[PDB]
């Protein structure tokens, strides 16, 4: 309603928060600041590389620049039969040119690097963005921002902070569309109140983990803290090399001969006046460590990189590219938990605000017929899979075409079957085949 | 009937959860919370991850998001004798609609990501969601639900918890439907009693294990405990490694000259000013656990794995996808012990549900058929399987076409024995032979 306070909403955020400076803490800071200050940093690089490895992944696969959004019709039983007849070519028009102009927008407007420096981030639980009319992005954090809901993951109040300025985003009441007012501490700033058609403008923050849900969600490197094994035994077996064999201080008692200056100057092989040994190194004793750590260390990337999909070509490996792409596949799904949720705080929410902000009828140019609602295609992936495994069979039944005993289309319908893709362009009927011969 | 108190049946269910409390800390926990507050973590990472891993394949089987649920007709035997006449291409007309209206609606309606964060709790024993009319789900948790049989598993009084709020979703009795009302604590909101036909309307608890049952299901993670023994390991080697190898304090007796500050001071080839090495280190003596340990996480790394059906591409493994792929399919079997299960409180509790708040008649349009029982694909698996076989076989049989002792489609009618794929579209008769010649 009306408060208008983010101190209450940060404190509802502490744990969510916290739990984040950690995570931040053994891999890339940052990211986060910890809560004159010379630097501190990550020992153990591998857990923070891969954090940096995913990013790329990520940015891509959530979008590739080349033709990720499909704006859908999407079919109406009167819409899919008017047109026909046959306007669905301007329906084209009319759609490509949207998909054209988005496609030149956002690269154009360089969302993409912006979106991958709060993308990344993200990978840590996460994050608000974006506005409307060089146009860019910004990029609230959770030192930033607050937000709730008692519900199932929807917006109810949204506080900032940057400078102080201070904006509400409330869900109203005898409402509908959202607004939105910016505050200095007492009152407001007269930018005012946008209702904000539901979703439509604007700026949707991205929930990540999903659990249990009512919450700025928590995830997730967070579920990733067997690396804290590999730093600290980072850490552990460096310290524990280092200083022993270097720091050899040259104890000599003070009583007379042996006297520090002369002992530096004599060449390796030269004598040196002194008394029998009297002067001696503090080297320490047997440290162990060794076999132990070091195998774990290296167990512990092999275990951590599947979690940060590298391609991981070690072996190395050889035989070699489909080998490679194997691996890659059946590992890239392991996140594909993940592209779910991905996808809801991103696909969506990301097309469905500009074509939102795009209703501005400045060239969007249709006031968009509902519903075009559209749907960011990625995986199918399988259906790929599939559709390959008859064109290895159906080549083993080439040989037998000649034999009179059974027939080959019945059987080429019963593989068919075991492969799920089942008719509609894959069956030959009888009426077609004189035009050819 | 009408009591109506949570706090009876959660008294009820304390062993099923506090299972879940302990299956829950060893791995990603959260997930449940133990019981400021600072952070604790699971160290062993590969149990964590496996449960992460495992999340996305069961989304993915239990559905693809391509074209997972067939609605069957199903044939009641004059419904199959009418139609004929071939009024089956509007049943398909009537049912793909519907088929093609959820598939539509259930990734249109973003539950996929929402069931992916509760289905992966459900890896941890067992959990209630949906609601009807954005409309998304919400993913009620252990901590919060309470429910009933004494049955082979049916549902007897709901109750729930979230901010308080309470249901109760109570079998009436002179009855049939279901009544649901809402409470705070003393009685009700007046959003009132609706019967609910069944289970349609709504909202099913899962149940995951089934034994012996009568519960809330105990399940599952719970049969694997192999991982205390890695996390356990994983610990006690790194402590132990640790410690000794970083945390070298310098003890020197404060009787006189060696000076701790001088001793910092000089480089690593400096002599010092010092009594005969009065001071000295307290580096620990020898420490085991190399050998054993190291050997055994790895051994239970392998044996973890196959559990959490990781496609374990390790030599690596070149040969190959076709080896890659017999390794997928006998270990996900594995698993197919509990795809009935989870088909179970899944695929026909899913659609089921939905196609019944889908008798609302907004665009469902038929007040359904009885039946239009659906069910939900998924494996069959061995009829690919058994039907390639004849293939390298009757290859086989190519060599001997032109030999007169023995007759070829007797001898395959043999094989086809063997691989229990008989007749129907396998044989080829007399009549049709010359049409073609």
Redesign the interface.
Known sequence: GAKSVYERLKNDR??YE??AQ?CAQYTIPSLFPKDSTDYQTPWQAVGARGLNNLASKLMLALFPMQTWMRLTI?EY?AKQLLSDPDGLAKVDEGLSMVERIIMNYIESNSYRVTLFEALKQLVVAGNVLLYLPYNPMKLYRLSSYVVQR?????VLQMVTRDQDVYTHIYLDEDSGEYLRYEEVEGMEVQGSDGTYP?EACPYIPIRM??????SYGRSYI????????SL??L???I???S??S?????????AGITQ?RR??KAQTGDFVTGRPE???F?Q??????F???K??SD??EA??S??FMLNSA??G???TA??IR??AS??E?????VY??L??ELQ?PLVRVLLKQLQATQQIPELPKEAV?P?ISTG?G??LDKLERCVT?WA??A??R??????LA??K???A????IDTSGILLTEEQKQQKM
Chains 1, 2 share one sequence.
């Open positions: 502490a744990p916290t739990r950690n999407s039983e008692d519900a199932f993951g929807n539901k983990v999903r659990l249990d849900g009512e967070e579920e990733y803290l067997g690396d804290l094994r600290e035994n850490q552990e077996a310290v524990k090399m200083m022993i270097s720091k050899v201080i040259g104890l000599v008692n003070p520090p002992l530096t009297d002067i001696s503090l320490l004793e047997k440290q162990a460590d076999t132990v750590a195998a774990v167990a512990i275990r951590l599947f979690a070690v072996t490996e050889r035989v489909e080998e194997y691996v059946e590992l799904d392991t996140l594909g938990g779910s949720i996808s809801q969506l609602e749907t199918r399988q259906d069979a083993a039944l040989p037998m000649d034999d009179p005993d059974i027939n019945m059987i319908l019963r593989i079957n075991a492969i799920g």
